[model samples]
Target: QHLVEVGKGYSCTSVNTTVFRNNSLVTHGDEQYISYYDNDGYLVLGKRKLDSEQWTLHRTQYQGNVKDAHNIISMMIDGEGYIHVSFDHHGHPLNYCRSIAPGSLELGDKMPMTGVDEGNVTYPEFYPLSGGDLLFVYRSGSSGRGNLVMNRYSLKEHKWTRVQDILIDGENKRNAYWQLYVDEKGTIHLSWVWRETWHVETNHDICYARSFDNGVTWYKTSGERYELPIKLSNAEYACRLPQNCELINQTSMSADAGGNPYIATYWREPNSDVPQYRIVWNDGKMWHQRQITDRQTPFTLKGMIPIARPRIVVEGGEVFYIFRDEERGSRVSMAHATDVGTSKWTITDLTDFSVDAWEPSHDTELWKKQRKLHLFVQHTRQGAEIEPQMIYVLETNM
Candidate 1:
């Protein structure tokens, strides 16, 4: 494993936060792309060849709310190699743009997708489809009351269309925090936890849904058809945990080659005080969960930000969980399982120094193609006085 320093990024706050980055590092073809906020809060874009360390950096003509960590930058490359980016959002107007040309660093002017639910948006994320199109998802309301919205960008027509106005309805009483994955077969797998209020402790229960035909229709794991606008009463609950169990929202999820979804999260058992990393997955027969970590320290999920969220990746019979924990001196740590069904895991620290509140975001496309893991690494403090830190991409073979 090796680390390549990209450039200096904002580090005073969680502006360079890993979980929110959704994709701080992404690869398309032979080139890899990266995004971050510089010391002055200017949006910076960088690209490099997969075989070299030298990067061509471009500072875009835009700025983000670096002080507010919720305003994160999410980016993806379309099938035609056009880079699409959405940033500087926290229940405000959408800030989205694309590359001036295919695989170009220069960005065009900001634009809207459907232009209907463009007023209030947060957690803007982009997922590339099997074919060259892209799917964009985000929240359309405030926390604890927001609805999940979806949009698709057609590569052929070079236009955007609304896929779902409200894929997961919060019913104005509670909201869903979801993680989505598009499998190799073009099937969309989604898993989420419902939050009843702005309080983080209200997060509870893992629900799931999938779409075989892009984002048009949804279904449960049992192949049961789901009505549009999946509600609380109709959603499939993969794992049921009561409120105040230290369940976190928006961690990560991935599916094996067989299309079985695996979700990585942390929550305390019924009578336990320590919150440990857990893996909940479907083996095509039944839903099974196993505790992968035996953490000793006790922490509560009551703040807007968590210590770190675990990122899961499954390759054949092996699975990897990347995360940070105060118990491990707050460094970037990974837990590996060569045979996932055995529940045996080996833990290792990837970084020698502490990352503070950093999480894990990798090159999904690269992993899908070659099973290589390239993680976006940065040291950030949630609320502290710190200088700008260098952003690095840790390339390793798993």
Candidate 2:
């Protein structure tokens, strides 16, 4: 049942799956946009109108750590219509910046951020708030022993305020990967996995929490709330996805209109031929888990990006997930509301080739109009490197 098409392949190549966020490619209004490190060692923002064919390229400062995924870059548009960008950070100095031009991060505009670029940083994620403020989160140290620090940018005060510095996984293990979603009600939900060390095989368990007052307070799924300032050595992070087995370094999250957060995660123990595709959702009373797909290849190589993790797409009451499997090829894993409620899924093989899927940049509003899902993806060959890695606009009807 795969409804995918082979669209144009882009030239931008990523260092690895762990370096970039799942939502790096973002869209605003009619503008389709993406930010990545070009092959020539430069931070580039490539955007175009939906009705246009040519892409407008904006080149920023020369990037020094071009080949290192450790210095992965991330981008997001703020409520004030400014394109915010973060790059060149991995347990080192932070290189955070924002577009100087208003209304558009147009060409020739210098993207520079002033407030919070200091100290060691990694995995920088920018979450735009609805009321003109901005929320920024990043990890600040070595794996298994790092600080999951967060800061809030006041558009009114023009200052960045430290919200919390919660050191997860005790003093030894590290919170390796994280997923965040700010619902329509402004409630923030976050999930992450704690790797015992640098080894991804040591991925111990997953944890969940939420913030209602803009990180001022946190809570579990049972409606029981807790105070903020969760720090190193003291935080109730009940293991949400504890397998006591090896896991991957990626997870995706999406929220329905009701603000319930849904998480998609995958895992495969040692020597297992197939990995388990699972989804967990917080239903206000408890967190429920359901296996979306049975045993499938844990690893699938596609272009410059490796297909190891699953991406969740929540539309209306129907929840859909995208994963690569040897059998389904390029099919999308969909779970109807009724089926998901009972820990069951209706797997559909909807595409011809699953080998080319990457971190798909999603546009929901456009899908409402065109009846298709559009993403900015890089097309790569099977054996050759995705040289001069260019980005392509891909669309599919599912």
Candidate 3:
């Protein structure tokens, strides 16, 4: 097969480490880095600026009730150059980890969040709206399914106003999961998924939605989009979302000049004829009902996971689609929508950036183990004392 660099994927080999947790990768303005703790919650923000020789790791010691999960360490800078981080409540969010950066970051005074007790507040995202205000959106797991919502926080007034829940459901269903984005005109966009039937197979109907008035209402592109399921080799009923579906969802929305939300879906397509599946969105509408790629794309273990914040930035007449790719060993891949923008875009492999060298990943028979465990539990009667099965637990290695 002829390998094409036309918007293709690459693995990061220059930066190597099993300790780098992909979820900890954060992007704000010019640089993106990983932030985490070696111990309990000693979080440090490392930097790999554009064209830097190598990743310059910087450390910041924050003082807040012993951090539990500091995943919301990324920021979005406004026109005036102020960095904003929403909130991260560690693992036990609903109770502890209700904290922000200790003091204000270099961007502005520390804008900490309040009034929520961390039932499931996560992936705090921000977009600078008009009039010195910022629209912040995140996934609220208050309901069983996640709710995409936005709140306007006044930088001057130091206050926050509740917007509304953006939708990702069809007809009248309530469900969605992903990083949400609000544009200049306050129109909100979000991506999500739901299980749907496929002939004899049951799969997912991946979707996205938009809301204009802050977040009061929503429209799932009027049912104009859906993604078919990416089935696993053995567990054909299983589906994997971009960013592994727990705390992280999709990458933050990358907007074009006209406020189109550019979101791409990536899954680990292993051992099949095809390895990567890339699907994209314009505004809130997904461009296709099926995975969008080309002929001869890699179908091995190599995947099409777009790096976080891979949006088209049109500068002057030349438009560039810059993004990080954990494939090819955590290298960054890019494309010039103009240079190779015709039908196919020439994707350039940006080779300098680095993912953490210590992060780890996990593959599990745990799912099968979990299935067996459930069956065992079902077989146990309430009055029949359940004895410990001769199963030894060991740590998972990715």
Highest lDDT: which candidate?
1
In candidate 1, position 148 carries an lDDT of: 85
278-304: candidate 3 lDDT, tens digit per residue: 435542333532232332333222222
Q: Name the runs in model 1 displaced over 4 angstroms.
A: 303-306
- What is the TM-score of candidate 3? 0.52
Error of 3 at 344 (Å): 2.2
Question: Where does candidate 2 stray beyond 4 Å?
Answer: 1-13, 16-23, 51-54, 106-117, 142-144, 167-169, 172-176, 227-244, 268-273, 296-306, 326-339, 342-357, 361-373, 380-386
Quote the RMSD, in angstroms, for model 2.
4.7
- Could you tell me the lDDT of residue 163 within candidate 2? 82
lDDT, candidate 2, 1-398, per-residue tens:
21222223333334322324534556666776666666666777767777676677776664637455556667776656677777777677777777767545443432333345446777787776668688888877654346677888888786678887652334443445677877767878887776655555667566777888898788877776755444323444534444344455556676776788887776554457455777777766666776676665445321133343666666555676655544554333343444466636666643344434444445433443343466544533323345554455555445
In model 3, state the lDDT of residue 97.
23
Decoy 2 TM-score against native: 0.80
